[PDB]
Design a protein around this ligand. Structure first.
Ligand code: SF4
Ligand code: SF4
Lengths: 190, 181, 63, 123, 239, 121, 387
């Protein structure tokens, strides 16, 4: 039709009027049967039987120094700088990793070296504030910094936590296998 | 009823053996219950680091998008075709009343129509003066509705409501929550 | 008193064979005094700790 | 949230300079009355008249503002800091912001002339 | 009939289309019929309360209303009380500064007609000195919201119990969301050993903060853009 | 006399805090006629406000006056529930009284500065 | 003269939150309350004005740190509404069903954490276990766990793995048993039913006056949900019942959360059957990155890949308020575009902000153990409220 005004098709729907709630006498079960569930605690022993059933089933936990949970190829943990085949540092200072690290953990100075190609003089992550965006991985055209899926690198000093170029190239030396394995499952989906 | 109870051989769970299965059918609340462990040679095999489907994977794309020959960018542009923020003064609504509309203008004499425009565009009249000036048909055409009713606060897509109540409901009666949709 | 009546009832239960069919009658009179002494408080709701979070029963009487 | 906290007032803007002055006078009386409560509550090292001679000189800082409404925002900020200190809402670390100069005598070579500024190129 | 005999899903035929045919469309057409509807409501609002509405505006079905500072309460009653216009529910308020203009801050309101499934936005303006009144007389939850945007800006709400700071240091001075106020603030925190407590000493960084918005094009590279104004409510040309 | 617009305790309906109003129609129509009288008393006949709400409440009051049963009238309204319509009509009855003293039918009392509604253009 | 007013929690009163909370108790009855929030208040809004929208995105999975993905979603929605772009079909469904497994995660954390706060220890572990199963499903798509560098303001960061869409079905068949199992010892449960039958009543018009939303407003009786009132993201294209409560109690606010598992599983059943094919990001290379396959081959893709990671993408001026239905409530966001590439301003409407603001209107008169059951069903995670 025409509505009133203050009046959409949002009327109250069909049967929105809730039933008048049942009293003591509009109840199908006997008072004795109801109070059997009252005193003898039916829904108490019911959940007690539930947790007893869970006693006789398997746990889930793993022996962590002996078993490890699931690790995706696109998992991220600490960093590393890859190298080329025949071993060349692979990082040019495009500064994209400095440009889009939203905590500004990246700090780079870089100079033209002897042969004339550009290489990085100082590459430095502040791992206090590396926030695991992983955007720094997605920002390298030449694919130099990556996300090594290590997380077990817990330090005892803040001094240990400033990864310069040398620690990251050592990590790129170390984890080179796994970074090859991960990019063999991610480089399509990048 | 299309999503009701299904038996436990279609649930992808570690299950049981067979005399202990015959035990636990007699000892459970419902027999069709998963113990929560996924099946080891099915769940997460092969590992995501080694997927044979991942070997050939170029790009997902759509046909009017990836069409190299036919489209330019500016036809499929979307950032530079944004609508402008339509702003309205108090004064331009008085312009909408007396000068009229592009649907139904009230202005001939296009030379002096600019002069009749411009003092109102400079503030010759007031809004309540225009309201007294506006006719009953003017108010009931471009301010109120054709019955002279106030416009309902309008909505994007009005969603009428059902109330599912019976055995298709997610709770039977006694439980206070209903399941409208 | 409800702790105390247990120690009042305690000499009864040791000697209950001697008081056959009669100390029964005496102690049952004693209990039937104490039980209505109990149901004083439950009708006065002596352990109700009721809340003043009332939903404002009184309606919108206007104009 | 119908009801307020203990000392919080509805903010209201005095139309005259005199009514503002009346409110500020009552306010300084409120600080001065609650000052021995503060040394108990914030467990401070020093004495009550030092609190009082700060509360005086802080209003001495803003004695010479012309405007009505800039003194109005100034009064509202003062009332909120009263509201904080009258409860446990500030803590004693945040309470001892107000005495940097008291707790430590500054140190050797506070620069005064040009030269002591210059030898540490103005600190 | 057992969990050893369950089939896998990893080997089966899946759906495999060669190239999906997704049609192109500007995502503003679906608004347009409603948007041209909304204008008729909005003009109505200005005809309803011409004393208090400086203007209306709308951009992609977000209705925005233009209210003087001493004008808030008479609008918000009408937005709450009308049967045709019942918004009933504050959603969020805050402020935005524009220090280029004379009246510095502007205060924005958001409502939600849960009957009629609609939103509405109410903008006023206030200099840091002058107030805006409190809508805590009507909207009950709003007193918390007004408590928020006090501290972030300094913008007041006259007629408001429990006006005091929140979500900042108690002894804080200044206001954070203010374009003159620096990013790191003035005071940093360290535990002094000798006072056996923490002290508030002025700011020293290890690394200076580096924005990179200095590289920026002056003109905004977005174009002028078309309109979606209704043909009723733009000005008819002469002749 | 006096009128009640919301039973704050009674038998429950779906909206909690609202209970089933006994005899909705006479209280509703008297609550209407208060509005009908008041806006004609205090609002001058130029204003969109009175010409709208007089028409609106008359059109609402026609449906209320001419139909009896519960579940049909509210679908004829197109607002929410019956008690809910009672409350919102009570609400606009309060509104029109406040508009009598706030005088919305004037011209605007405070012009904006012309350099204020300028964002980025 | 005043009550002997207490500090509720410095550190570990309510799990997942620093709930400093003044109470004035007169009979172990709260006459009034005053929660001081600000203890997590990092000041994130002052930061997000200094970073590009490109960079500004993982501010928001830090916000509301039990349901990251709705925050990600609502900022992506605000920017897509602002940019006048359209995410493709595949992107719509993948964002939809991640925003619903995050709903499963959010209620799975919140109900069980509330049961621990009350004292029921068994769902507090039975739920976090299935949450670990869902940590795995965040892990295969995007980065690590619990903070997904995901949905971009252009749409989606990247495609799935090759077999998550299968594997999630193997999970989804057994979640029903693992959900009805925890339902079996809390729903009837005369202890829980006693503690939660009329505790903290929330009437209808007072629910509106306190600005509340989501499961609370739908518990009070008003049928309002952004998934169905102002729809988006093919929630239109997926059939989905909504539960609505009866009283204003905490028991409806419980039962609706129990119901939304049953609802959001049906989401996954109607999503995994009908996931289409198509581009998972937006079509163009002018608001998000080109894929790394062809940027090493094409000259045009590099300059986009560079400008999006130095400048970023340019946004038309304007302002939007996009609000969607977080599982906590209506979460809104109000962004004011300069026309530059930093947002000139961006307010959040955290959902629990008004929930905390509506505390002492609800919490009057109740008891102090009753002042715990009221806490975790308005879901004060405190990552939301201050920011
Ligand atoms: S993941 Fe690490 S390197 Fe990348 S942007 Fe974040 S903090 Fe910087
Ligand atoms: S790792 Fe990538 S972003 Fe970082 S400096 Fe090297 S090329 Fe640039």
């Amino acid at each position: 039709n025409i509505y009133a005004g203050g009046s959409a098709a949002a009327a109250p729907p069909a049967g929105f009027r809730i039933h008048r709630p049942a009293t003591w006498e509009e109840s199908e079960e006997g008072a004795l049967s109801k109070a059997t569930k009252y005193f003898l605690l039916a829904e108490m022993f019911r959940g007690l039987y539930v947790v007893l059933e869970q006693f006789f089933r398997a746990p889930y936990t793993i022996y962590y120094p002996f078993e490890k949970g699931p690790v995706s190829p696109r998992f991220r943990g600490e960093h590393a700088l890859r190298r080329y085949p025949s071993g060349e540092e692979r990082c040019i200072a495009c500064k994209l990793c400095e440009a889009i690290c939203p905590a500004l953990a990246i700090t780079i100075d870089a100079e033209e070296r002897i042969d004339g190609s550009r290489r990085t003089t100082k590459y430095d992550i502040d791992m206090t504030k590396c926030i695991y965006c992983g955007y720094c991985q997605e920002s390298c055209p030449v694919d130099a910094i990556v996300e090594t899926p290590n997380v077990e690198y817990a330090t005892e000093t803040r001094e240990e936590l400033l990864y310069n170029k040398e620690k990251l190239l050592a990590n790129g030396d170390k984890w080179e296998l796994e970074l090859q394995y991960a990019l063999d499952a991610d480089a399509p989906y990048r | 009823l299309p999503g009701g109870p299904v038996p436990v051989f279609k649930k992808y769970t570690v299950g049981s053996k067979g005399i202990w299965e015959k035990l636990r059918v007699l000892l459970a609340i419902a027999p069709n219950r998963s113990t929560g462990n996924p099946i080891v040679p099915l769940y997460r095999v092969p590992t995501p680091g080694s997927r044979p489907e991942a070997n050939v994977y170029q790009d997902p794309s759509s046909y009017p998008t990836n069409d190299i020959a036919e489209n330019p960018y500016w036809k499929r542009d979307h950032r530079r075709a944004y609508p402008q923020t339509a702003f309205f003064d108090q004064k331009t609504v008085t312009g909408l009343l007396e000068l009229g509309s592009e649907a139904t203008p009230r202005i001939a004499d296009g030379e002096a129509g600019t002069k009749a425009l411009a003092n109102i565009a400079n503030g010759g009249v007031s809004f309540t003066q225009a309201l007294g000036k506006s006719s009953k048909d003017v108010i009931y055409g471009e301010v109120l509705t054709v019955n002279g009713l106030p416009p309902v606060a309008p909505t994007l897509a009005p969603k009428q409501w059902k109330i599912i109540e019976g055995e298709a409901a997610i709770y039977p009666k006694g439980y206070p929550c209903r399941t409208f949709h | 008193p409800f702790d105390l009546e247990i120690s009042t009832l305690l000499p009864y239960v040791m000697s209950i064979y001697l008081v056959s069919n009669y100390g029964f009658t005496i102690v049952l009179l004693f209990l039937l005094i104490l039980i209505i002494g109990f149901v004083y408080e439950i009708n006065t709701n002596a352990l109700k700790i009721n809340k003043h979070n009332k939903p404002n029963t009184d309606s919108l009487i206007y104009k | 949230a119908i009801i307020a906290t203990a000392f919080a007032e509805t903010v209201k803007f005095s139309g005259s300079k005199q009514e503002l002055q009346k409110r500020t006078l009552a306010l300084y009386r409120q600080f001065l009355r609650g000052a021995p409560t503060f040394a108990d509550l914030y467990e401070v090292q020093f004495s009550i008249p030092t609190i009082r001679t700060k509360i005086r000189q802080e209003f001495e800082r803003h004695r010479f503002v012309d405007d009505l409404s800039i003194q109005n925002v100034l009064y509202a900020k003062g009332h909120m800091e009263y509201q904080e200190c009258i409860n446990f809402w500030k803590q004693q670390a945040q309470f001892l912001k107000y005495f940097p100069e008291e707790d430590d005598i500054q140190g050797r070579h506070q620069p005064s002339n040009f030269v002591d500024k210059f030898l540490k190129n103005r600190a | 009939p057992s969990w050893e005999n369950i089939k896998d899903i990893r080997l089966d035929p899946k759906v495999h289309v060669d190239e999906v045919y997704e049609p192109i469309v500007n995502p503003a057409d679906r608004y347009l019929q409603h948007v041209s509807d909304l204008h008729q409501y909005a003009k109505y609002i200005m005809a309803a309360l011409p004393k208090y509405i400086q203007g209306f505006s709308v951009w992609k079905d977000e209705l925005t209303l233009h209210v003087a500072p001493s004008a808030v309460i008479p609008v918000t009653t009408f937005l709450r009380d009308n049967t045709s216009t019942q918004y009933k529910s504050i959603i969020d308020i805050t402020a935005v500064d524009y220090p280029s203009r004379e009246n510095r801050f502007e205060v924005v309101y958001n409502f939600l007609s849960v009957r009629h499934n609609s939103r509405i936005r109410l903008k006023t303006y206030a200099t840091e000195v002058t107030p805006v009144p409190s809508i805590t007389c009507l909207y009950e939850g709003a007193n918390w919201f007004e408590r928020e945007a006090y501290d972030m800006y300094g913008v007041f709400f006259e007629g408001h119990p429990d006006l005091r700071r929140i979500m900042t240091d108690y002894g804080f001075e200044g206001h954070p969301l203010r374009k003159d106020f620096p990013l790191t603030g003035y005071t940093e925190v360290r535990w002094d050993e000798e006072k056996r407590r923490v002290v508030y000493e002025p700011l020293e960084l290890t690394q200076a903060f580096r924005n990179f918005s200095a590289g920026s094009t002056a003109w905004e590279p977005v174009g002028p853009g078309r309109d979606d104004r209704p043909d009723s409510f733009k000005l008819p040309t002469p002749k | 006399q006096s009128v009640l617009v919301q039973m704050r305790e009674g038998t429950p309906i779906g909206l909690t805090g609202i209970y089933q109003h006994p005899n909705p129609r006479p209280a509703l129509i008297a609550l209407y006629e208060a509005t009908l009288k008041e806006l004609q008393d205090k609002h001058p006949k130029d204003s969109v406000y009175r010409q709208s709400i007089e028409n609106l409440t008359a059109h609402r009051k026609q449906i209320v006056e001419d139909n009896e049963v519960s579940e049909v009238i509210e679908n004829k309204i197109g607002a929410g529930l019956i008690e809910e319509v009672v409350i919102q009509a009570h609400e606009e009855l309060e509104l029109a009284k406040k508009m009598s003293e706030w005088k919305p039918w004037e011209e605007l009392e405070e012009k904006p500065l012309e350099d204020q509604w300028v964002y980025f253009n | 003269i005043r009550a002997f007013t207490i500090n509720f929690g410095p550190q570990h009163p309510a799990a997942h939150g620093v709930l400093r909370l003044i109470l004035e108790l007169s009979g172990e009855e709260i006459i009034r309350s005053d929660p001081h929030v600000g203890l997590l208040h990092r000041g994130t809004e002052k930061l997000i004005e200094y970073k590009t929208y490109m960079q500004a995105l993982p501010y928001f999975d830090r916000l509301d740190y039990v349901s990251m993905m709705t925050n990600e979603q609502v900022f992506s929605l605000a920017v897509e509404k602002l940019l006048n772009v359209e995410v493709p079909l595949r992107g719509k469904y993948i964002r939809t069903m991640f925003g619903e497994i995050t709903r499963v995660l959010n209620h799975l954390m919140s109900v069980c954490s509330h049961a621990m706060d009350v004292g029921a220890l068994t769902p507090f572990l039975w739920g976090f276990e299935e949450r670990e199963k869902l940590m795995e499903f965040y892990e295969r798509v995007s980065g690590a766990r619990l903070h997904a560098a995901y949905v971009r303001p252009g749409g989606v960061s990247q495609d799935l793995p090759a077999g998550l869409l299968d594997d999630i079905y193997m999970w989804a068949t057994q979640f029903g048993d693992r959900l009805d199992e925890i339902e079996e010892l809390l729903t009837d449960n005369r202890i829980w039913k006693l503690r939660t039958v009329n505790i903290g009543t929330v009437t209808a018009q007072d629910a509106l006056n306190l600005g509340l939303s989501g499961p609370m407003l739908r518990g009070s009786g008003i049928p309002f949900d952004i998934r169905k009132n102002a729809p988006y993201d093919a929630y239109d294209k997926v059939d989905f019942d909504v539960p609505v409560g009866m009283n204003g109690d905490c028991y409806d606010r419980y039962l609706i959360r129990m119901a939304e598992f049953r609802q959001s599983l049906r989401i996954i059943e109607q999503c995994c059957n009908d996931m289409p094919a198509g581009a998972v990001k937006v079509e163009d290379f002018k608001i998000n990155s080109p894929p790394r396959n062809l940027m090493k081959e094409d000259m045009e893709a590099l300059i986009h890949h560079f400008l999006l990671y130095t400048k970023g993408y340019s946004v038309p001026p304007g302002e939007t308020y996009t609000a969607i239905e977080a599982p906590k409530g209506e979460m809104g966001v109000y962004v004011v575009s300069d026309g530059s590439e930093r947002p000139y301003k961006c307010k959040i409407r955290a959902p629990g902000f008004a929930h905390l603001g509506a505390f002492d209107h609800i919490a009057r008169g109740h008891f102090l153990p009753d002042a715990v059951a009221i806490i975790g069903t308005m879901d004060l995670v405190f990552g939301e409220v201050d920011r």
